[PDB]
Symmetry: none
């Protein structure tokens, strides 16, 4: 038997992948153009280098932090570099999948040229009763918007998102929500008030 | 305002099989002399290992996949040809040989790692978009040019099929068999993905040789 105490702690040290004008929320799968900003590929390389200093399957994991006009948010998104590819102009590209919220903590040092920060992962709690109820309403509101656009496959797949937190964070795909609105969705930890937040904006966009 | 509708192509990882002389274009099938050639045989063995079957009893061995890249005194081309090792055995001359079929164009990108002693690079399969209407007219004009050369050469079995090739991309890439074209021209054929450009390239080179 081994003791092992105060381990598996919730505070991680992750490289910051800055999103200059974009927000990636947990559950989202988005492409990343690595041609435009140097700090982006440096964060992926720093994440991969730290995995190679731990010695020998880990797809590299970064901390997706939106940076609106030179200022980082208080919450980041733990993201997995699922795959690297090429964009139509031959740009180096990467597929990233958001996993969970990470409350941004104090800065730290690490390998590579990326900024390393410490942070505590905010494990999503089990869904409450109002969250399930709010998820049903948000599905209907989002479906109505997609129906006017004729995006019926999108209607079909959105209706299959049964986790209320994942459904609320699916608002990151909405083109009618501003970058700053999606930052507030990221920083709103509680799912119920996060759903009520995106439900109001979605209800506002329908009324236009 | 991140772009959430970006088209993302898949990135392949293949062992580099260097070709000192000659360019293998998509649609071609050629032999490979493995005699006293460590680089070529290492690429095939690295491809075989990377193709090792992945199940306890249901595992099926796939054909090895290599990247046939046009290299003269270094300076590997920016585009290689995805090659499928169709057969392995001995060539008629007695040499240890392999038969490779060119499949598609691959844009050579970042280097990487892999099994075996071969050099591994990352690459992207380049689209073969449907032939334009103008591309159809380039193919009809190009068939008349290559037919005159083949009929002058007496290659009647070849000219029979060449003028039946419906796809303009396959028709243009068949110029890799032509002795009257140089490898620097062939590498440029391997270089231009657009079928309209290639036909418009090879039509000019064919006329200036006729």
């Amino acid at each position: 038997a081994m003791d092992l105490e105060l381990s598996m702690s919730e505070t991680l040290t992750l490289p910051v992948l800055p999103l200059e004008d974009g927000v990636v929320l947990p559950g989202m799968v988005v492409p990343l153009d690595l041609s435009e900003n140097g700090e982006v590929r440096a964060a992926i390389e720093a994440a991969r280098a730290a995995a190679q200093s731990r010695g020998p399957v880990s797809k590299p994991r970064v901390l997706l932090v939106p940076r609106l006009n030179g200022r980082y948010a208080d919450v980041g998104t733990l993201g997995v570099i699922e795959q690297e590819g090429r964009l139509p102009g031959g740009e180096p590209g990467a597929v990233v999948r958001g996993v969970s919220r990470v409350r941004i903590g104090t800065g730290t040092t690490g390998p590579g040229a990326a900024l390393w920060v410490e942070g505590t992962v905010l494990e999503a709690p089990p869904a409450s009763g109002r969250a399930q109820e709010l998820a049903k309403e948000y599905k209907g509101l989002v479906s109505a918007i997609l129906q006017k656009r004729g995006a019926w496959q999108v209607v079909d797949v959105v209706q299959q998102i049964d986790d209320p937190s994942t459904l609320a964070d699916n608002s990151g795909y909405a083109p009618y929500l501003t970058d700053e609105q999606k930052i507030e969705v990221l920083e709103t930890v509680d799912v119920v008030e996060r759903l009520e937040l995106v439900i109001g904006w979605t209800r506002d966009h329908l009324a236009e």
